[PDB]
Ligand binder design. Sequence first.
Ligand SMILES: [Mg+2]
Ligand SMILES: [Mg+2]
Ligand SMILES: [Mg+2]
Ligand SMILES: [Mg+2]
Ligand SMILES: [Mg+2]
Ligand SMILES: [Mg+2]
Ligand SMILES: [Mg+2]
Ligand SMILES: [Mg+2]
Ligand SMILES: [Mg+2]
Ligand SMILES: [Mg+2]
Ligand SMILES: [Mg+2]
Ligand SMILES: [Mg+2]
Ligand SMILES: [Mg+2]
Ligand SMILES: [Mg+2]
Ligand SMILES: [Mg+2]
Ligand SMILES: [Mg+2]
Ligand SMILES: [Mg+2]
Ligand SMILES: [Mg+2]
Ligand SMILES: [Mg+2]
Ligand SMILES: [Mg+2]
Ligand SMILES: [Mg+2]
Ligand SMILES: [Mg+2]
Ligand SMILES: [Mg+2]
Ligand SMILES: [Mg+2]
Ligand SMILES: [Mg+2]
Ligand SMILES: [Mg+2]
Ligand SMILES: [Mg+2]
Ligand SMILES: [Mg+2]
Ligand SMILES: [Mg+2]
Ligand SMILES: [Mg+2]
Ligand SMILES: [Mg+2]
Ligand SMILES: [Mg+2]
Ligand SMILES: [Mg+2]
Ligand SMILES: [Mg+2]
Ligand SMILES: [Mg+2]
Ligand SMILES: [Mg+2]
Ligand SMILES: [Mg+2]
Ligand SMILES: [Mg+2]
Ligand SMILES: [Zn+2]
Lengths: 54, 145, 141, 104, 69, 143, 67, 168, 53, 103
Amino acid sequence: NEGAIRDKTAGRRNNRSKDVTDSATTKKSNTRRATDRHSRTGKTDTKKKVNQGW
Amino acid sequence: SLVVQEQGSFQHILRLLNTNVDGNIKIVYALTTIKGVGRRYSNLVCKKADVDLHKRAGELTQEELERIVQIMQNPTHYKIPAWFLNRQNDITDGKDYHTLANNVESKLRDDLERLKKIRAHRGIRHFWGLRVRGQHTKTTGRRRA
Amino acid sequence: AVPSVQTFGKKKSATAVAHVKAGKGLIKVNGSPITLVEPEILRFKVYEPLLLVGLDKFSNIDIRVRVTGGGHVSQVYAIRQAIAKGLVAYHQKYVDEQSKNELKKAFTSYDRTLLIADSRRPEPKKFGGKGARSRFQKSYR
Amino acid sequence: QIIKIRITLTSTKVKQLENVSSNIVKNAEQHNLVKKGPVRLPTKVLKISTRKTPNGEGSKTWETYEMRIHKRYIDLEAPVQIVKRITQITIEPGVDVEVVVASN
Amino acid sequence: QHAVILDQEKYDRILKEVPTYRYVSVSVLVDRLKIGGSLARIALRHLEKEGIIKPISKHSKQAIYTRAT
Amino acid sequence: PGVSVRDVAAQDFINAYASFLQRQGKLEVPGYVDIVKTSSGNEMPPQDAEGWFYKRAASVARHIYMRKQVGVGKLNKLYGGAKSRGVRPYKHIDASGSINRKVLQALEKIGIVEISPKGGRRISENGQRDLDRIAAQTLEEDE
Amino acid sequence: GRVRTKTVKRASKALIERYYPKLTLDFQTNKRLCDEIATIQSKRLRNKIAGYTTHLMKRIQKGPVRG
Amino acid sequence: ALISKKRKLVADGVFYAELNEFFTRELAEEGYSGVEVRVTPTKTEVIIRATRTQDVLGENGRRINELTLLVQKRFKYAPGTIVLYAERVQDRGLSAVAQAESMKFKLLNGLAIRRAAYGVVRYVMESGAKGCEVVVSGKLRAARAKAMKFADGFLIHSGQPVNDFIDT
Amino acid sequence: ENVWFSHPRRYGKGSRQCRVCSSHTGLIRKYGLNICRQCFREKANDIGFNKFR
Amino acid sequence: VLTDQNPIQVVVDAITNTGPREDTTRVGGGGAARRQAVDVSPLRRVNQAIALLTIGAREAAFRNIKTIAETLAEELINAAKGSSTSYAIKKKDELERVAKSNR
RNA sequence: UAAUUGCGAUAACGAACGAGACCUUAACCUACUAAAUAGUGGUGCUAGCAUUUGCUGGUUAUCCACUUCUUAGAGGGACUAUCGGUUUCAAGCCGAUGGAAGUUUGAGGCAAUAACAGGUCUGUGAUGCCCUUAGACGUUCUGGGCCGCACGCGCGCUACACUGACGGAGCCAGCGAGUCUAACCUUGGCCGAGAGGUCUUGGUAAUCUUGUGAAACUCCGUCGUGCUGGGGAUAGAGCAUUGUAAUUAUUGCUCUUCAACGAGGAAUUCCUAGUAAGCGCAAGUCAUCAGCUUGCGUUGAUUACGUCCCUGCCCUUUGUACACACC
Ligand SMILES: [Mg+2]
Ligand SMILES: [Mg+2]
Ligand SMILES: [Mg+2]
Ligand SMILES: [Mg+2]
Ligand SMILES: [Mg+2]
Ligand SMILES: [Mg+2]
Ligand SMILES: [Mg+2]
Ligand SMILES: [Mg+2]
Ligand SMILES: [Mg+2]
Ligand SMILES: [Mg+2]
Ligand SMILES: [Mg+2]
Ligand SMILES: [Mg+2]
Ligand SMILES: [Mg+2]
Ligand SMILES: [Mg+2]
Ligand SMILES: [Mg+2]
Ligand SMILES: [Mg+2]
Ligand SMILES: [Mg+2]
Ligand SMILES: [Mg+2]
Ligand SMILES: [Mg+2]
Ligand SMILES: [Mg+2]
Ligand SMILES: [Mg+2]
Ligand SMILES: [Mg+2]
Ligand SMILES: [Mg+2]
Ligand SMILES: [Mg+2]
Ligand SMILES: [Mg+2]
Ligand SMILES: [Mg+2]
Ligand SMILES: [Mg+2]
Ligand SMILES: [Mg+2]
Ligand SMILES: [Mg+2]
Ligand SMILES: [Mg+2]
Ligand SMILES: [Mg+2]
Ligand SMILES: [Mg+2]
Ligand SMILES: [Mg+2]
Ligand SMILES: [Mg+2]
Ligand SMILES: [Mg+2]
Ligand SMILES: [Mg+2]
Ligand SMILES: [Mg+2]
Ligand SMILES: [Mg+2]
Ligand SMILES: [Zn+2]
């Protein structure tokens, strides 16, 4: 604590003087919706497989 | 029916405990302007002081003002119990006080300085200016100042 | 045996039970005079059964009423309904039927439920809001 | 040797407990014991409310399950056999039966 | 500001005026002269002692009052 | 031709009975009586410090009279109101126990009430007299 | 609102077809008729059936029906 | 003793549920379709309904003795205060549980899909039901999974009838 | 054989569990059910809890 | 107290005098949209009159100490024989002045 | 028509799923069967006021009678009834009357064929595969963290006050839960301003808590438009409770501290009758902790009885080079 309390900088008004990173007002950005139907595995199947089991 | 006139007997803006009380209001509420007296303490004070509470503060002859004051700074001796008192079982001194007027600001700082000298986590939070009790600081208390 | 009758009336969950027997004509609610009913401004609502048919009709009968359930307004309407409903059920039994129908027809002409229970009951609160129809507030983006 | 007996029947299915009550009611006053007929005790509804969802997602959908418990009692006055008979002769799955000596 | 005590000039104002108004209440006394409204109320029960004011209704929220007679 | 306290309105009765027990002079109003709020759910002390305890004592008299027996815990819940939690929602909080318990105790000293069996406190034949007697006074006072 | 289904309008067209001499212009009696000349599984259905047939009968005596 | 009636009936229903499962895991190979618990004064009765009864009640009363002893130890019954019985079944082709266990046992045994689902739908039909439905979900082979709905006959899905005449 | 292997288990979640699946999460304790609400809907029929409304 | 008369006779008069005789509806209007002058049902004349007067009394008495009862009377008496110092009288006259325009 | 609900039109006829029927719950039953674990009248015994007999009580059984209120079995009841106005003279709609109820009587349960790479492998001793498996990604123990605060955004709680606050006083709910091989729901007495403490008690419960004497609300008073006695954030000091453990304040209590907030910009949500909104209560969780939720009742409206302007959605037509189907 004696470290902490003594520390300048890390006090409050200092945080208040700094302007707030643009990443605070940011959007979540949603990161890949429009690829959702397309299968990214690239394997797919074969009518011989789709047939035996079903 | 208290309907009454007087002449010079009513006086607006008198002064006690280094503060200016409103000369127009009821005395229980006129006194609460003093730091350290709330509605419950001013109310009990007028009661031990043989003061008719139906009066405005602009009534209350100087005698009666002197009674309110002595009682105010000696509550423990007027049958006012210890649990009615804002600073109890002090820390150092150890006795039952009721602090008033500009001393409330003082003793408050003393306490604050105390655990700040001791560097307990609570004074740390005071020093920074953060919330002292256990609340979440994430969403609330913005706009600061 | 004595000539008694027992009627009731209801508004919401309040239910008032009335005892009409031949007698000196005291009208009491919860063992207390009907003049002291103090939902207050509503007091004539319990006076109404008497003032429509006439005050003379209660000279030959005592009225005991007792209420439970509901709230302070709904008990007013449950005793005013059990008082008007006990008057006719005393006349249905113990006096002529053409008189009972002048009682009923003076009530129903002015009635506010007066002899016929109000059927409004509370709706249930469904999940998704604070009430039956009230929904919690939504957001979208 | 007439006792004063209290039979209490509690069950979740109405139609089995109704005709166990009616089989105690008929057989008791068939040969004339006293009566003290079935006293219906308010049916207790045990409600449970959970979210339909496992995990947390989707519209916040609430299902509420009921178990309904129905109680009644009958009071018979009779000795010896018609005590231990009327207990054990009128019996049925899902119907809970208990018989009390008197009072305490 | 308003007046929370009588000046004896305000006491004279009261009795030589209030019989003029047909309607008197808590607010009529406050607006018409100036009064703390706590001492309008004390004026109302006092003006009623020997009526220059006749109650047609009273209540905790509202006091309704009429000219002397 | 005979009167019961049920024949006198609630407020007019407790009014003229709480100004009767203050005249009577024998109550035993407790030693605090000026510093108390009557409820942990209240804010300020009662505005009439003089006659509030007789006001409550006359209430508890008229309230136990109309019933079989009632205890301290039931007077608390009866006199406890809505407590402002501040920025948190209101809820009901029971009133002060020492107030009511010392009303039942002090009422026992004039004999307006007595220990009941079953528990609680019940109106006493003497106190049934005194309430009914002033029930008539208030009734007869208004002629 | 209030519209009667086919399962109700088909019992009403079927009864009147056979039982016309036995039916009436009064709901109450035909209700009872439905317990005799029909087996209907719930009380409401019976009430709903008879209530329609009589509506038919009522306007049958008015004029002939396409039904 | 001394439970509440609200809590006791609830604790009883739990006792049905946990017992019903145990026999499903243990008697699965014998075709267990369900149980009934009978509480009578002195001897609570437990009745097991499983299409292979002789495998339930084992060699000369054994293995129904294993099952009672397990129940006894489990639920803290004094020996003899609880008894196990065995029934054959009423028309196993009319039981949901029976056909689902029958299906699981067809696939697992090396059958294929349509034949097993059409086999069971036909048996439920020839056993005199009104209708039949068998729905196999999951991946019957190869990565992406689909569903197969096999059905025949008549089914109502909607009202209180769904409780009376259909079991799933 | 040696203490040092445990800590007070007397109350709170984690003295509890669904008597089926052992989850301490979202248990239904009402009426002493002690089944988690996820298993409780699976067994609600066999327990005799049904939905009329 | 103020008017004698019948206190109920004047609320009637106030309600009759504060119903807007004709009114305005919002036409589709092609972007910035023209308002059409339409006459108003006598049930709406009663509905809207009662709203105007209570709203008038609600706004006046808010941060005035004066009670709702006194402001309602101040509202109702003024509206009875229309003063134009009443909230509802002012709103009606403006609602009719606009109707007379945009026809 | 809420409805592929029907009337009709008819190369269609006759039908099935879904809809409806169904079930549950809320309204009516002075009709049936009963009840000290529900009540009511009478009689005993007994208190007080009155003297006129009467009024108001007390007594868990003194005793008799009843089922109106309460409980829940079995039934009954609505069918949109009756008359009238419309229309293809069709299904239906609208009006009035009567009725407990005429909006599918209110509100729910259930709910077709297909579809989504929607969420859930952190509910599961459901699980394929990969990963790790003794310096473990197993498990336990100590402590810390999930709450960390320049800020952006969602659900909310408290407010700006006089249709109020404060003090007395009046005083009325419904849904509920609750103690065994064990600490529950707790009356009553006593102590304590309080929170709380304590000695006892009833209840495994229509029996005791409990009339849950809840809150809004009503009456009388005080304050008087002044960030005021509106508001109660932030903080200081002291006392209690839960717990092995309360510091980064679990919660509660006491006195003091008395901030923003003066009706909220562009936007935007929910709602048609016991509903909106106001109000509290129980249940879940819970050792302690509700500003949350699931239900419950109390007080109780203004406005509509409509339209396709806006925002969705569906259907028909239509176009297609799409069909893994405009990701
Ligand atoms: Mg101060
Ligand atoms: Mg916080
Ligand atoms: Mg900021
Ligand atoms: Mg109740
Ligand atoms: Mg989870
Ligand atoms: Mg209260
Ligand atoms: Mg109160
Ligand atoms: Mg608050
Ligand atoms: Mg056909
Ligand atoms: Mg069907
Ligand atoms: Mg359906
Ligand atoms: Mg351990
Ligand atoms: Mg169509
Ligand atoms: Mg069909
Ligand atoms: Mg029925
Ligand atoms: Mg009518
Ligand atoms: Mg419906
Ligand atoms: Mg579905
Ligand atoms: Mg995905
Ligand atoms: Mg899973
Ligand atoms: Mg999780
Ligand atoms: Mg978290
Ligand atoms: Mg932290
Ligand atoms: Mg949300
Ligand atoms: Mg108040
Ligand atoms: Mg206690
Ligand atoms: Mg102390
Ligand atoms: Mg009871
Ligand atoms: Mg109860
Ligand atoms: Mg202030
Ligand atoms: Mg305040
Ligand atoms: Mg921390
Ligand atoms: Mg601390
Ligand atoms: Mg919108
Ligand atoms: Mg916590
Ligand atoms: Mg809680
Ligand atoms: Mg939550
Ligand atoms: Mg079409
Ligand atoms: Zn589980």
